[PDB]
Each structure stands twice: as structure tokens, then as C-alpha cells.
Design an enzyme around this catalytic site. Sequence first.
Site, PDB file in Angstrom:
ATOM      1  CB  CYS A   7      72.005  43.514 109.209  1.00  0.00           C
ATOM      2  SG  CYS A   7      71.792  45.283 108.956  1.00  0.00           S
ATOM      3  CG  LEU A   8      75.841  38.194 110.786  1.00  0.00           C
ATOM      4  CD1 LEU A   8      77.188  37.748 111.308  1.00  0.00           C
ATOM      5  CD2 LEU A   8      74.899  36.990 110.667  1.00  0.00           C
TER       6      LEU A   8
END
Lengths: 158, 113
Positions: free
Chosen positions: A94-95
Site C-alpha cells: 500500500c503506497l
Amino acid sequence: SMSSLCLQRLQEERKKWRKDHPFGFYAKPVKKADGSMDLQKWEAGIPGKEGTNWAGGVYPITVEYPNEYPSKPPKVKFPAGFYHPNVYPSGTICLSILNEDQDWRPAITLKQIVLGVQDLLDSPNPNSPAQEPAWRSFSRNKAEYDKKVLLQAKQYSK
Amino acid sequence: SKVCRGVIKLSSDCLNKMKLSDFVVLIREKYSYPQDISLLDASNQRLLFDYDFEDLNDRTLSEINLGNGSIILFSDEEGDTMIRKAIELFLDVDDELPCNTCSLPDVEVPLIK
């Protein structure tokens, strides 16, 4: 079903990477049954930063490009079960720069992605609790967290 | 409309003896491409050869699964201001031209930004 712009941009990505990639990183298209390369699926490795608990490890990711790339972001995954507060049980990172609704822009190179993933390792983002047990340890049992991280660094030794 | 196009007429005999390395040599010198190129199977979209990927260098066109009605994409991969336009090449093998035939089509491929 890849668009010709996708093919064009992917070939350029492979080229920029060759000329300029951060020290200690690697990224290479996967080889297929017939002996040829798949430009849509890449294997890469992320070295942990020195002077942090991630030091010594090189962490494997897969970069998978959609048919609509660069309109849509790649999908980046550590192996399923990888331990980090911002990594899903499936291994998906999750970026914000990898989210189409957030900070992703077509100009984002593979270099920017891998440096972003590397920065995430030692600085987990509180707005992305993706793994419950890892978040729990990080928040209230830092000594169990650190220890798990040090084990994972050894697991993925260079 | 951006990729240039042309049909190569080949012999069924030529498809089994043609080496990938020399096939690249032929295409590069006809359309004035630079040293660093990449070569795709334009249909299934496999990468078969480039400046770094040389595993398939020694194989013949049939040994890398290129047959009748296969299409090839050849691109400029030098990273300079002036870039040679990409050309897409169809592989029409008929029966029969004189064996050892590989005639590349006359195509006006321009230098673009």
C-alpha cells in the site's frame, strides 16, 4: 491486449533502468516457458537501508503492469506472508503513488517506485494499516516487532 | 498510425535456417536503426531480443516460435533526441519463392522527436 503506448513505455522503462538504477537494486522482466521475456511481469529486489533493522536483507517484489499502463499504476507485491504494517496478507504493498485515485501519475518511473517501497520499509504509514498483527506489534510491542523484522532480514539475506 | 508497416516475403526453407542475430542485422541496416534496438513478437507480445536480452541470439526464427502470419515490432532504444520510428513487420511465407529468400519491404521510416 497491451496498448502500443504500454509496449512503448515499458521498453523505455527497461532502458532508463539500465542506464540509471539505484545502487543495490535489481529489476528484470520474467522469463517464460519458451525462453522469451514478459515485459508485463518483472522481478525486482529491494535492499534494506543500513543503520536500520532491515539492513542486510534484499527483499523480492513482483511488478505487474496492467494493459492500460501508464494510465493505471503497476501492482507491486512482496511474497504473501511478508511482514510489514503496510503490506496486505496477499503481499500487495500500500503506497499512495501506486493508487490511481491518489498520488499515481503516468510520469512515475520504476526508480521512483522502488525508492518509495524502500522508504516504506523502515517508516510505516499510519494511514495504511494493511496487516493487523504487524500493526499491533509496531504500536504496542515494538520489541516483538523489531525481532520479527530482524528475522526477516536474515531470511532474505544477500 | 505511428508505427511504420511492411510485409516480408520469406521461404519455408528460410524460416528454419534464419538466425535471430542476423535477422536483427538485416532489419537494422535497411531502415537505419541505431545499435540499441528491441525486438518483440507483436501478436503475443513476448520480448525476444534486445541490447541486454541475448539468450535467443543463436536460435532460428522457428526455434523462437515465429511462423507464418507472425508479426514483429522493431524499436529504437538508444535514448537520444532523434529517434527512428518503430516498424511493424508481417511474416508472409509462400510456396514457393527461391529458397533462402528474405526480402524486406521498401518503407520510408522517418526520424522523429
